[PDB]
Amino acid sequence: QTIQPGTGYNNGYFYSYWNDGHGGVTYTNGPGGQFSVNWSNSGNFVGGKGWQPGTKNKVINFSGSYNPNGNSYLSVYGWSRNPLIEYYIVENFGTATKLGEVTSDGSVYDIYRTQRVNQPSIIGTATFYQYWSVRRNHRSSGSVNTANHFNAWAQQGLTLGTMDYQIVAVEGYFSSGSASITVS
Structure with a gap:
């Protein structure tokens, strides 16, 4: 169903839908x-389905249509605790300290670390690192072996804590677009 921001479970999958209060979603x-x-x-908004909690070895399948008009991401997206980390495995997007590259599921990814300062998080306002893998060959369907990225991050010194939620998410930032995604 069309829902308001929040978290919960639907048809066997965790979901998270968050926004900053600026309408049009x-x-x-x-x-x-x-x-x-x-x-x-x-x-700014983030929404998608997946698992609560995720794992460090999940193979995530996704397929769909993704047509952003501006700043947007289509990502494997999730959190860890101790350390508090918000991470992205970006498969597609619309319109940082680089740490290396990884070749996974048919494409080279570029690995970055960013720091969020005094920003919203799963534990409230916090300062925390973000880990990124940005796919070079953009796509809106396929499989992601998350262990390939988590291990590559660790080899670069990027440590993940205990996993919180783990979803395939569509994120937008002051833009328009349309997307329909099936996760498995």
């Missing part, structure tokens, strides 16, 4: 691991 949970999101001149 319609997020809808579908059957199974399916979700769809339409946004018209939104602020």
Whole structure:
């Protein structure tokens, strides 16, 4: 169903839908691991389905249509605790300290670390690191072996804590677009 921001479980999958209060976002949970999101001149939002908690060896399958008009991501997205880390395995996007590269699931990814200072998080306002793997060959369907990225990050000194949630997420930032994604 079309829902308001929050977290919960739908048809066997965890979901998270978050936004900054700037209107123009319609997020809808579908059957199974399916979700769809339409946004018209939104602020910042993140929504998608997956698992609570994730694992450090999950192979994540996704397929769908992803048509952003501006700043947006389509990512394997999640959190860890102790250390508090918000991480991205970016498979596609619309319109940082580089640490290395990894070749995984048919593409080279570029690995980055950023720091968020006094920003929202799963534990409230906090300062924390973000880990990124940005796919070079952009795509909106395929499989992600998360262990390839987590191990590559660790080899560069990027440590993950105990896993919190782990989803395939569509994120937008002051843009418009449409997406419909099925996770498995």
